[PDB]
Design a protein around this ligand. Structure first.
Ligand SMILES: [Cl-]
Ligand SMILES: [Cl-]
Ligand code: NA
Ligand code: NA
Ligand code: NA
Ligand code: NA
Lengths: 365, 365
């Protein structure tokens, strides 16, 4: 079986590392210099706007998946007429547009931050009048990290936010800040028949809006049960096949949906070294029509390497640390690798401090 | 750093799967259709007899290793003048020739089967007269599996064995059969500075001369201590860097060296799923000049897939079984994949019976 992946970044790289031992063959749409290239059979560079050319590429394979949900869902529909794509165009359409995403949650009685579609300055003033500050004006589509957004903290920021962002091609959304205690994510995988394998909750720490640490299992039984119910709902409504990630804000014993990603996700990278079957292997099994692998887990911390990465020789000296370099070059804000460590005992917790020190000296956020 | 591997078979494939997450780049000398191709950066087809061309290929990389010890050790020497090769030409020269291998053990007071260099029919008759039957006449070099050998069980077999094998280019060796109880192997990895990481002993089951099952840890403390001493001796004498495998016959509480392989070995494949750092990751760390990863292990069985492999859909249903298909085509006697399973409990031991049944129905030995 041949699997085509749209995108040749680190998620594609890790999908192939996980899926290749299953005897599956991987091909990416991307560029020669991209980090998945060395671990996939072929890479083909096609502009996504060339729908006919993308479809012709896709027809070479048995199933197609993708690593970036910001892709046109209509392109996905066109491909799916010829070769099965997973997960669904509906999942992409909803997850990729913040307004559609929050509106979908609301329509299903699922809690989110307060939000308003912003299509005029007057609408923004009304949104602030109704839901208050601090808040953020964001592009509905795209806006990777700090891009496509303006944080509104004072009345005088309202007009400034509007003037900066009003011409965004795909519109804007107001979102009120949530005063959460911490953040967690629920990752799961759904097979072709709708059976779901659940990972334990991961607790995620962000710095400057980027995940820097993920720890699993996060053993709060009430939250986990609630998160699992939400996952089941999204899987059904999207007719979802593959790995799905849901990020939450936590307030006391309540969950609030933050956002979803219809793919393997950074907050699941711990599962490479902490679960019997990683989120990557299971995504591959799902889309290949195979039964999912066991997701029994053990305590693991994942530390992200942003901007730069400690020297491999320094990391290797911490002999229980599992190194995941994506073989990228440094650049401020760029995800260049991550480190996983099982936490069983004291030798582990102090190897962890050493990793943190190395990361602190190498990162650029 | 770029690592060149001579050979593009399943061992190279697994070296790259293990080493790529460390941020290392892999290149093979081999053919496009070989199973490592899809997981390495480049593959280059050069006949090994073209020494100048092989050396020119090797100069592109930072370190060179190999997956088949039957390579010319003089070629290795030529390469090593320009770019570091690990492990050593001495390790290759000794391990690849059964007479040199056994002679080396004997010269160091290490036990092996009784053996005689056979360079005439009269010498063979004398060898049988001295050490008896059953025995085997084998080529000193090559002789993969049942190739290059003739089992001698009666007096009348002596002349037949000689007539068949006498023109072997690199000579012959007589070996008396050992009445062993079972077989075990010691795998270890030595770093650039001579520090050794030891794996637990694996107990290996052969069928028709091919390993079909490996189980680790084999918890016999006396044997393990003896095997570790032998490993230390070979590492020192070979100035060895990389993963080394030593196969033994066991008679009671005594070990007898069977043969050695200066590389990752089939009897260590369990370590992909049963050790913190697999024999493959550690080979890569060793030759890259990195400190070795922790080798803490858990009970794991490896089952080999010879000739054919069960359907992936059938294997996937046994959700704790870790699948390692090499993406090869079937052929009698060919190693096409292996399966690993951690044995923690009862759900495991009965998933194991199911794997065995699937393998029994698919294998061709
Ligand atoms: Cl990339
Ligand atoms: Cl091959
Ligand atoms: Na490639
Ligand atoms: Na989303
Ligand atoms: Na390749
Ligand atoms: Na040998």
């Amino acid at each position: 079986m041949k699997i085509g992946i749209i995108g040749a970044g680190q998620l594609a790289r890790m999908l192939s590392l996980a899926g290749t031992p299953l005897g599956l063959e991987f091909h990416c749409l991307g560029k020669n210099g991209d980090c998945a290239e060395e671990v996939v059979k072929t890479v083909t560079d096609i502009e996504l706007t060339k729908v006919n050319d993308v479809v012709a590429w896709a027809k070479q394979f048995d199933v197609i998946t993708f690593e970036n949900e910001n892709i046109s869902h209509e392109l996905i529909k066109a491909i799916n007429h010829e070769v099965s794509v997973y997960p669904s165009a509906k999942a992409i359409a909803i997850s990729q547009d913040r307004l559609l995403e929050k509106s979908f949650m609301q329509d299903h009685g699922i809690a989110t931050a307060k939000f308003v579609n912003i299509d005029s300055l007057a609408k923004l003033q009304s949104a602030v009048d109704d839901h208050g500050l601090p808040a953020i004006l964001k592009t509905r589509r795209f806006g990777y990290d700090g891009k496509g957004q303006f944080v509104i903290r004072s009345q005088e920021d309202i007009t400034k936010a509007w003037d900066v962002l009003k011409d965004a091609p795909d519109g804007l959304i107001y979102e009120a800040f949530v005063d959460f205690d911490y953040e967690v994510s629920q990752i799961c995988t759904a097979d072709l028949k709708g059976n779901i394998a659940f990972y334990p909750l991961a607790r995620n720490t962000h710095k400057q809006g980027i995940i820097v640490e993920s720890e699993a299992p996060f053993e709060n039984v009430v939250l986990a049960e609630k998160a699992q119910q939400i996952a089941k709902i999204l899987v059904k409504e999207f007719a979802y096949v593959g790995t799905l990630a849901i990020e939450f804000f936590v307030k006391g014993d309540e969950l609030i949906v933050n956002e979803i990603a219809p793919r393997v996700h950074n907050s699941g990278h711990w599962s490479i070294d902490g679960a019997v079957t990683s989120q990557f292997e299971n995504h591959v099994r799902a889309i290949a029509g195979l039964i999912l692998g066991d997701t029994t887990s053990r305590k693991t911390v994942m530390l992200n390497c942003i901007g730069g990465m400690p020297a491999t020789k320094d990391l290797a000296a911490l002999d229980r640390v599992k190194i995941h370099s994506y073989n990228k070059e440094p650049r401020k804000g760029r995800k260049v690798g991550h480190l996983n460590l099982n936490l069983n005992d004291e030798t582990d917790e102090y190897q962890l401090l050493q990793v943190k020190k190395l990361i602190a000296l190498s990162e650029e956020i």
